[PDB]
Design a protein around this nucleic acid. Structure first.
Ligand SMILES: [Mg+2]
Ligand SMILES: [Mg+2]
Ligand SMILES: [Mg+2]
Ligand SMILES: [Mg+2]
Ligand SMILES: [Mg+2]
Ligand SMILES: [Mg+2]
Ligand SMILES: [Mg+2]
Ligand SMILES: [Mg+2]
Ligand SMILES: [Mg+2]
Ligand SMILES: [Zn+2]
Lengths: 187, 157, 52, 105
RNA sequence: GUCUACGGCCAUACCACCCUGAACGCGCCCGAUCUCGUCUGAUCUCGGAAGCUAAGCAGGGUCGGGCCUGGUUAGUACUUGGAUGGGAGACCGCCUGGGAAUACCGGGUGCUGUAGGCU
RNA sequence: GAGGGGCACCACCGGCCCGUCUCGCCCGCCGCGCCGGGGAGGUGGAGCACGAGCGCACGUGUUAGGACCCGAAAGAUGGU
RNA sequence: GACCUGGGUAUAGGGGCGAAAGACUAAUCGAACCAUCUAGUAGCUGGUUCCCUCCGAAGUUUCCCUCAGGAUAGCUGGCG
RNA sequence: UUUAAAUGGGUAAGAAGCCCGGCUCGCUGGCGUGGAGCCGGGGUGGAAUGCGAGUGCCUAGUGGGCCACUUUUGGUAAGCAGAACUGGCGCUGCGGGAUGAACCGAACGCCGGGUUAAGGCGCCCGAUGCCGACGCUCAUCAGACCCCAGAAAAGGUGUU
RNA sequence: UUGACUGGGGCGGUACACCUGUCAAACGGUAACGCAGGUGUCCUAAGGCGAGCUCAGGGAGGACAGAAACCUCCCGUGGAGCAGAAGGGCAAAAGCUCGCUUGAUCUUGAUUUUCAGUACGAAUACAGACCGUGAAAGCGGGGCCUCACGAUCCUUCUGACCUUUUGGGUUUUAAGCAGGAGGUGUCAGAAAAGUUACCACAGGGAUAACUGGCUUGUGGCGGCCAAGCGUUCAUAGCGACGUCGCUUUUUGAUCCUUCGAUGUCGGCUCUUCCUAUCAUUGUGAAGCAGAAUUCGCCAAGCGUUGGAUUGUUCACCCACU
């Protein structure tokens, strides 16, 4: 015998996608070749996001992408996201930016192209920039889900703000004791 | 079962020690506590208002709040399988300045004045401290006399 | 009987609900039945407009 | 437990200390046609017997006695509730005690 | 060389007794008309300057008592960790490290800040 | 070497909306009032701060149903 | 002899009948038998069906008519 | 209880630090005071050893335990009742203690060579079949290896 | 419907909510039907603030007057008092006396304690008001600190010139919002008498009544010491005050095995075993003249009966030996 460990020692990341999509498997064979052969960390971040779940790959609206590329310096780089680009109705004009994504939506890819932009896939991203040089890779808000605001301490805990599971929001549904100082206590 | 009451096991620790009773001296009140000061908790027995709890007597925390008569102290407390940063309001007579960092605030002073003291002179002073090394190969002297012979004494009652 | 964080649910199954169950297995066969009742009526009032 | 007959306390109407007439709070005639009395009457009525618990396992011997402070200065007439820790015997206006007393049992 | 007013540390500063105390001061001291307070100008409050180092107060003394500090007690008593050590047990010795307390004996006995005065 | 722009996320500060509380002055008129609107501070909310949901499938967990299987002493209804 | 006995006839289930033993009422009686409600309920006993690989417990906290049971925190695994 | 250990508990051993200059304030206030906040600027080698860390969701089983040193309570005592610290058993085979839940060694994929641990080496039974060293001991009830499975006070001109 | 805990259950007690000292092993935590006690109150002052004062006890004096009356002087580090249980704390004081008072009032958050780090209760540090007291600094939102208490629903009272009362108005009522009270002591909170030997079910060796086991207080049977008793004479025979043991034929104590069952007293019948020997064999010692007894040794070979009363084990009596 050697030590007294608790045996973590099996790393619990993903080595391939659980998806059986054969187009997405060809991107992995494109980029796990590039990741082990080009000595760039762009192709290690893109390769580990092609592995990720649909939950860990959130969508990115078209108004964050033009908000995070009107920063100083970003004027002639490419928008990279391993994930989908939905549009904002809220935005009024679109610039002529160059993007790259798995799966831009129909209304969003009509509005980029009217404004003079250019959509890419990860195939023609690899032929343009193999190292990932001149790219701004982005991500959507992965804690933007409604699931994450039920997560926290516990709703009855003091200073919690944790949104309990109620079947219907309204009066008489979890508002009487433990929620106001009159009926018993407030938490 | 075992009387979960405040001020329970404090027959001797909320007691003034011996022959130091009476009204408390006045330099205790003339102590200046600012934010981030490292203070250590020791509840007295004469002043009755702001004694913390027996959980914190002997422990050492950091000031985040300064009030008219008291000081807000964040201390680490050991609950069962984890520690917690608890913020306890303690009056000014139950705390004092902890000297526990003041041997580090001396050797950040005498280190930086000695760092530039060799920068202007070009040496390799190696101001990082080492623990007690094994002893140097020295050379004892037994000049003239002889090493005194001692023997184990007999047994008696 | 409950557990950690979940809904607090009131399922209305405390009654003899298995004798009153309705299975829509005839609902294809009633759609072609009420089509034929529209067709056989549309030619019975033959010149008149359908849907009355 | 002896409290005085008048008392100079805060009244929420004007935000001042000004004297009050303190008497004892009595419970009051239990009104019919309240919502839980209307409910208990249409529940108890019929067959079925007693339909709600009647408490019988009584332990305490005192009550928290409560005072009602009545703001004496006119066209205010502001009343409010003030409690005292519980007591067996409660005088309300009598016998301020003096310590020069021959008291002998 | 000391003091007065205010202090910090609160006995090396206290306690009992005995000597000494220039000059300023501190004080005892002499009075109740006012201010004020009493059973009582004793205290407390108020007017002073006729006397006094007698006391307080300050220095010093005592093979002083305590107090402070150090040896001795003692590597003793306890104790960490260890042993297929001993012993019928109670308890014990050793290994590896840490290490007291009383009697007994020795030495000390106020130190200082701010402001003002004497010499 | 250094510098720059900083995704997501985390911590903090600031702001915003709704309820209440203290403090205060100003503004508007389908008509001048036991009217309407605004301010500044502190607080209560499952909030805003450039959206992530929906439908479908599967896996796990829990619950209601005979509910993993078998087991009472009973109670009731109508009869012989 | 308050005798023994046949066939006829009457009384039925919280009812009957009892010189009283809770006796007897079709081998069933301190509440019959048949069918249904019904697969009633059980924190309680018993059982719970193929292989290999990897990780791996707890018998403790707090509350409960709680003490052969739960809820809660700890311990675990899985997913990232 | 004056004194007062050993063992133990907290904290500190840096850039989230050190220093300089400036601006805000409705707080503080003799004071351009005090303190907070804010902006800009200056220089990183700051105990030993070891280690890759951080964080979120979902979550089963369990909620009768028992044992041994050490420290302890009740008890005459108990393979008794109840606690503290650590290890183990339960969940765990293997070598040894003849026997065995927990002792002592050591933890385990399937095998070959080597070497040991605890324990042993007359014969069961592997290995003293050594020309082993020094002493002690005679029992008509000898003795014989942690836990551990049997003894005391008292006594002997028995022998050393 | 007929509480729970429980060295089985019951009776008893409350370890069922709580506080003090100890256990507790020098931070904190820590169990038992462990030990020593306490609580369900009391207080318009025993709350608040300021002033002046010093306590318990002792010594020495003073008409009655003495251990204890009141008066005075001296000593007096808390030996007093602080409402009550303890522990801590306190002297121009937190104690005594006096003068004023009501902060024991209004309001929002945070923090602490138990703790899951939920609530109640208790508490701490503030802040915004309105006040008290003091010359002022200040102190004060109950008691010198550690305890003195209580959800939902329902009810009651108070609060705003509030909100809703269902087509629109007015009014009464009712419902709301905000916070006090009327309780759950099984104290995180049900609404509750028995009996069963006529009894039934699900279980439980988690749990008694029997043996067996650990233990030996107790019962028994032994030693060691020797003040004595024995005319004298400690030890022929005994032996106090002690003190060390054994045994498991007494009774307990415990709860390991057994609750899908180990047939539970006594007697009768019958076999074997033990020795701590009553008798029989061989012996040693007497306070052994003989006879008879008594005390030890090797020794369990061989015997240890017949009856009356009693279910008896045990007892007790008659008779034989
Ligand atoms: Mg006069
Ligand atoms: Mg006068
Ligand atoms: Mg005079
Ligand atoms: Mg003099
Ligand atoms: Mg003199
Ligand atoms: Mg002197
Ligand atoms: Mg001396
Ligand atoms: Mg040791
Ligand atoms: Mg060992
Ligand atoms: Zn008023």
């Amino acid at each position: 015998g050697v030590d007294i460990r608790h045996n973590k020692d099996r790393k619990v990341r993903r080595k391939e996608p659980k998806s059986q999509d054969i187009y997405l498997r060809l991107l992995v064979k494109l980029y796990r070749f590039l990741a082990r052969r080009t000595n760039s960390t762009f192709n290690q971040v893109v390769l580990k996001r092609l592995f990720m779940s649909r939950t860990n790959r959130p969508p990115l609206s078209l108004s964050r992408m033009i908000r995070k590329m009107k920063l100083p310096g970003r004027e002639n780089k490419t928008a990279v996201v391993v994930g989908t680009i939905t549009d904002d109705v809220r935005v009024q004009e679109v610039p002529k930016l160059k993007v790259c994504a798995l799966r831009v939506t129909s209304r969003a890819r009509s509005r980029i192209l009217r404004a003079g932009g250019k959509i890419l896939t990860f195939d023609q991203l690899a032929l343009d920039s193999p190292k990932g040089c001149g790219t701004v890779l982005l991500s959507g808000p992965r804690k933007g889900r409604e699931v994450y605001r039920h997560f926290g301490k516990a709703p009855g805990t003091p200073h919690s703000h944790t949104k309990p599971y109620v079947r219907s929001k309204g009066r008489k549904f979890e508002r009487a004791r433990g929620r106001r100082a009159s009926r018993g206590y407030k938490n | 079962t075992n009387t979960k009451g405040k001020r329970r096991g404090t027959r001797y620790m909320f007691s003034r020690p011996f022959r130091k009773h009476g009204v408390v001296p006045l330099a205790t009140y003339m102590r200046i506590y600012k934010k981030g000061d490292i203070v250590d908790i020791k509840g007295m027995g004469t002043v009755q208002k702001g004694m913390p709890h027996k959980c914190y007597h002997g422990k050492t925390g950091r000031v985040y709040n300064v009030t008219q008569h008291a000081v807000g102290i964040v201390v680490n407390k050991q609950v069962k399988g984890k520690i917690l940063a608890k913020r306890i309001n303690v009056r000014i007579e139950h705390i004092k300045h902890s000297k526990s960092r003041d041997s580090f605030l001396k050797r950040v002073k005498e280190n930086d004045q000695k760092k530039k003291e060799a920068k202007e002179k070009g040496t390799w002073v190696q101001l990082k401290r080492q623990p007690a090394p094994p002893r140097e190969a020295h050379f004892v002297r037994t000049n003239g006399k002889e090493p005194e012979l001692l023997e184990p004494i007999p047994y008696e009652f | 009987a409950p557990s950690r964080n979940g809904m607090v649910l009131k399922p209305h199954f405390h009654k003899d609900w298995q004798r009153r169950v309705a299975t829509w297995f005839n609902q294809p066969a009633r759609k072609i039945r009420r089509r034929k009742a529209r067709q056989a009526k549309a030619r019975r009032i033959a010149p008149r407009p359908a849907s009355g | 437990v002896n409290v005085p007959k008048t008392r100079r306390t805060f009244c929420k109407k004007c935000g001042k200390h000004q004297p009050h007439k303190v008497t004892q709070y009595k419970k009051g005639k239990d009104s019919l046609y309240a919502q839980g009395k209307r409910r208990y009457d249409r529940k108890q009525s019929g067959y079925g017997g007693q339909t709600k618990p009647i408490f019988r396992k009584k332990a305490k011997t005192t009550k928290k006695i409560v005072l009602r402070l009545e703001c004496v200065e006119p066209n205010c007439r502001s009343k409010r509730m003030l409690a005292i820790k519980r007591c067996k015997h409660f005088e309300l206006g009598g016998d301020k005690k003096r310590k020069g007393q021959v008291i002998q049992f």
